[PDB]
Structure formats: C-alpha cells, structure tokens
Amino acid sequence: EPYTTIHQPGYCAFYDECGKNPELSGSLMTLSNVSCLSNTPARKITGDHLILLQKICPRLYTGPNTQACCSAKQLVSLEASLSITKALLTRCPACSDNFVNLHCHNTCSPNQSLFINVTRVAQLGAGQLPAVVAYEAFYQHSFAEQSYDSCSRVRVPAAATLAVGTMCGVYGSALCNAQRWLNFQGDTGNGLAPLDITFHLLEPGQAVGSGIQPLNEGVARCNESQGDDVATCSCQDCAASCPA
C-alpha cells in the first residue's frame, strides 16, 4: 500500500502527533512524538498556532494568510528535537537559521508532499490514523550543499571545535559531507532523529519523471546580513566572510 500517493503543492504528507516511536528503544528520554499519516490539504494557521510557527519556523510565516502542514503540537516536538543541535550553532545565526529551516520545511511546508514520501508507518492506537515512522526527503543537491557550506566552518560555542564534526558519525570534519551530515541527522542509531529520514540529494536530471519535486529553498549566506540586523558571521566561522 502506498502512503504518500498525492504529491501536490498545498498538500501535506503527515499532520498532528500520534505518539511514541516504537522502533526507538527506551534508552534516552525521547523529546519528540511521531506524526500521523495524513495525505491531506494544508491547514490555515491562526491564533496561538501562528505565533509558534512564526517563532519556531520564521521563514514559513507568510503573513496573515499562512498555510502549513504541522499542528501546534508538532512545532513543540520540532523545537524539542532541534534544541541539541541549535545549541552547537549559536555562534552563527544564519547557519542556525538554515539548519532549522531545513527541518521546518520537512515538517511544516504547505507543499511538503512534493519532496516528502513516507516509506514506513506504524499503527499506534485503535481507530487512530497510522503513525509515520520512516520517510524520505528529496532535496536539490545545491540546496543541501549550500545549507552544509553555511555550517561547515562554524565553531562550537567558546571552542575551536567544528560543530559539523560533532555531527558526522564516524567521519570527522575532514571527511564530512553535505550528504553524510544529513544522513546522521535522520539516523536513529545516531540517537538524533525521532524517526528514519532518508535524504536524497538530486540534480535536476535525476528528478525527471520521478513524480516528485525536490526542495530548493533559499539558504542564507553567512557573509550576508539577514533582515535589517546588518550582522554577519565571523571569518573564523564563515569562509565566505573572509578576508576578515
């Protein structure tokens, strides 16, 4: 049985929280619940749900007329599981923003079903909708490379250690990669992800005829300022901010 049959704009892959991930062994306190399979049109985001979305996924706030594919409950689970990594990237807010937006789209994008295809589900309760336990994210290769490049040189708070090296499994910083960096982030055995995420980093010639449209969102360059702040990550954290 297919789980994500409608791959359309304005259409979600999953919506709401279903509960604990059964494949995750009771070893470290799980900070996230898992999502309910819901290949349905995106929701209009209002009230409290708006503020959360605005604060947790700023780049997905599109004015009073906002649509998204994550409930209020899902946004709390999002920030919970991002808290660990967000801490490592507090030197360079642009890279931090990029990392967060990468997962925000995966969970909240009103178009998520175009680049997300759930592969495995689990029935958590009786009468309840099935729970999404594994999915694959389709990204454009350049979007992934640009996201990784903005973070590849960031230092850990008050240290010289590179943050991506603390996030690339058996590969160090030297061997680390846009592909592998993401592979770690969607890996259960690496104790980071709440569920199995499979990252496919495609070039246009691969996505042709797939019936899928890979994510190609704008990624902030750390040598450029965001909004009206007029502030940029240092040359030690950002190769593009050099010469200093």
Ligand SMILES: *[C@@H]1O[C@H](CO)[C@@H](O)[C@H](O)[C@H]1NC(C)=O
């Ligand atoms: C996870 O599931 C339980 C039971 O439905 C619920 O108490 C909890 O709020 C959910 N989400 C979080 C944030 O753990």
Ligand SMILES: *[C@@H]1O[C@H](CO)[C@@H](O)[C@H](O)[C@H]1NC(C)=O
């Ligand atoms: C989505 O998942 C189904 C089930 O594994 C698979 O057959 C289908 O090809 C996937 N869609 C892709 C790879 O675009």
